[PDB]
RNA sequence: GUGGCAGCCAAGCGUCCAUAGCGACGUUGCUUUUUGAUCCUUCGAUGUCGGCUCUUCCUAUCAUUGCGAAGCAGAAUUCGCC
RNA sequence: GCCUAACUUCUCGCUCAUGAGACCCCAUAAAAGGUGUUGGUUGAUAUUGACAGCAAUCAACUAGCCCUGAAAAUGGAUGGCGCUUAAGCGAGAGACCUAUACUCC
């Protein structure tokens, strides 16, 4: 039922709080609530975070209990965690939202025009398919 | 204190299958199939291998952890029911009045008569999947048999509690029908 | 009646423990009353045997 | 912050008091609220607690003339309505005008049978610890005197069957629309470029 | 202070208010439960209380002191001429009761 | 009364001594480690304990130095043992508790919060006898021991997530399970 | 305080056996259907005993319903619970 | 949390009560009990394999919450509604609301 677990080396994504929107690696578990994470290659300092602010990703690194910043960085670039994460819909949605939030008025106008044209054409094709 | 993880496992003998999912088990063997729902407990039940079912609890307190072995024993009882079933033998004891026990309604109701001589007739319906039989060889003996231990024992308890004495001391008015043996159908 | 049946009936009717606070019919090998009314009293007495 | 239309809220899997407080705030702030499936709202704690609380509520009647005393409504919709009323200054004109904007129903009336309902995640019962019993206002109403549990159940079953058929048709049409966009790709490639560049797909 | 000697209250409070009936005709507040197996039949009729008489009947009641003995009993006559069926109406269940 | 206000109580080293007199021209120098919100409270508690232990009070003594101590390496996790004495509503007791943290000050703050939670004991009724770092195999509390496993794994079973900056109502379905 | 009612430890009664049922020496509470203490309201007036009549309410349950325990073999009787 | 201006804000625990609890004076509760649960103290046995049945266990204590002790008369009061990883209990953090008080005009 549960596939992703809080384990040493698990790559977590900081959902809320200080370093929101970044990835880090679990290097220790202090208790059921607090976990020490260090994302040296994702611009996250070695710190302790509440699990309530973290989200488990699908990447697990081959780390050692309390692996130092050097080792966790070596493992991060070895596994290429950032490229693989960017490949996922998880990161694609985030990038899309980042682009969305920064749209200008002219860009909004262009998007509206293009979107309505595309919708009209797709509706024509949908009518064609429905007739068959 | 919330233990991080606590689990137990049940191993299934040959010829039986379970096929669990969503916290409902579907054990099946020679004597049919028993389905049991365990969604009142928030545990994780899964198949580990071919004939092993694991019931696990994450971050449970004493009361929740107490239920793991309960569920495992329930599944073991399902296995026993599908393999050898369940059979409860009950004996009638009386000082003077023969307790006349019979079946009616297509062998779906047990009738007790003459219990302490009362002219009232005691009627006990049988749960679905359970059957009853009087022993023609051993007098005063009634057997309730079925696959599901819960229903078999419920029928036995219903019959046993149907016969109770009133306004006289039970220390020496010992009349009644009592469950004398709990065993399996197939000789074990 | 036959002694085995006597014993069978007594096992359910007499061989039990009685709580001294709420008179609850309790199992013979019990340490505390199961009823909430007495607050799980730990002091019990055997059901009065035939003297 | 006012909504143009009434707010339709599916009452299923909602905590009674939390939903009532949210709805009372909305009513006071000026919106109209419709609550559907009031029999599916839940109250935390075992059934006996709620049953005994409602029995004690029933015991509150005027000694002189019970026709004057508290009016103990048994329907789930009226139970929710009274719970919201308790959270309003209903003895004043403000509270009365706010309360008159609420409609609570058992099941989904035909008027709202064809609209999308909302949920308040802050009032969902799934905030309770899993090992915590909870009762259902439908069961409470049935056990305290509600006479239309089975009728509402049958009507809801028919509604669910019709909705399932509609959803099967909608699934088919959605697959068809996906295929239609796939086919249209050659013509819309000019515009899809702009859509994706601005991040909309 | 408690009343010195107990006595039951006068009258049945479930039959109150003792007010004039809303209508002259008796309202049927409930009908017999419908069994689909039995043949179609009506469940009510209308008549007029004509008057009372008394009759002598032979009693068949085993174990009674008047078994196989004649007894005088007062009876009421209700004149019930045939009724004409003028219309048919039906009721549909709704969350607030049956509705015509 | 004394209260352990402020998240992550600070740690101070306080050194003081009785004011020299003619009969005692040279006085012993006393030093203590005190966890307090700020240095004023640090001095107050220093004088409290020193007056308890030796015949000297704030009037007749002086504070040679007050300094703050910062965790040497807040980049590592340790197990801390805390010996404390506290008073219940009925009697006085000695407790030994264990915590896991990257800072001794954090461990002491955890101790104060835990005592408040479990024994309804306030900061004024608690004395911290001693705080040390315990090795993994010298720990004797199951809650701390169960985390000394290199293969430790566990999911997050029932995650209730709070929406922050959106409307109360939504058509989205709420999912508490994330496999 | 007095009046009424309910608990805790058990020295003893109970043929033997402290607790079936009681329970001294002590001791903890509850209630305002007793009588006291006070003098807060009322002396430009609240009609002051008892009975009759009529409602409703509370139980610390006499009877009846459902039960548990006896120094419960049964008319009978006792204790206890909802 | 809504009445009600100000967060269903943030962190750690404890509590399930067949009407739990909920804030100085303040609007009652005790002796004595619980093998409910959570922490601690002390003394033992246990890998020369500790208790039950043909890998930790045992015993006595201790104090947090909860339960029993806990009976009154019109229908009724954490102020009400309600609230159960709380909107309860304890320790804390940010921000915010609000006087005829403080500053300025």
UniProtKB/Swiss-Prot annotation, chain B:
InterPro entries: Ribosomal_uL6-like, Ribosomal_uL6-like_a/b-dom_sf, Ribosomal_uL6_a/b-dom, Ribosomal_uL6_CS2. PROSITE patterns: RIBOSOMAL_L6_2. Gene3D superfamilies: Ribosomal protein L6, alpha-beta domain. GO terms for biological process: cytoplasmic translation; determination of adult lifespan. GO terms for cellular component: cytosolic large ribosomal subunit. PANTHER family: 60S RIBOSOMAL PROTEIN L9, 60S/50S RIBOSOMAL PROTEIN L6/L9. Belongs to the universal ribosomal protein uL6 family. This is Large ribosomal subunit protein uL6. It comes from Caenorhabditis elegans. The gene is rpl-9.
From Swiss-Prot, chain C:
It is found in: Cytoplasm. It comes from the Eukaryota. Part of the 60S ribosomal subunit. Component of the 60S subunit of the ribosome. This is Large ribosomal subunit protein eL40. It comes from Caenorhabditis elegans. The chain holds residues 78 to 128 of 128 of the full protein.
From Swiss-Prot, chain D:
Keywords: Ribonucleoprotein, Ribosomal protein. InterPro entries: Ribosomal_uL13, Ribosomal_uL13_CS, Ribosomal_uL13_euk/arc, Ribosomal_uL13_sf. CDD domains: Ribosomal_L13 (cd00392). GO terms for molecular function: mRNA binding; structural constituent of ribosome. Pfam families: Ribosomal_L13. GO terms for biological process: negative regulation of translation; translation. SUPFAM superfamilies: Ribosomal protein L13. Belongs to the universal ribosomal protein uL13 family. This is Large ribosomal subunit protein uL13. Signal peptide: none annotated. It comes from Caenorhabditis elegans. HAMAP family: Ribosomal_uL13. GO terms for cellular component: cytosolic large ribosomal subunit; ribosome.
Curated annotation (Swiss-Prot), chain F:
One of its GO terms (molecular function) is structural constituent of ribosome. Disulfide bonds: none annotated. Pfam families: Ribosomal_L18A. It comes from the Eukaryota. GO terms for biological process: cytoplasmic translation. Keywords: Ribonucleoprotein, Ribosomal protein. One of its GO terms (cellular component) is cytosolic large ribosomal subunit. InterPro entries: Ribosomal_eL20, Ribosomal_eL20_dom, Ribosomal_eL20_eukaryotes. Belongs to the eukaryotic ribosomal protein eL20 family. This is Large ribosomal subunit protein eL20.
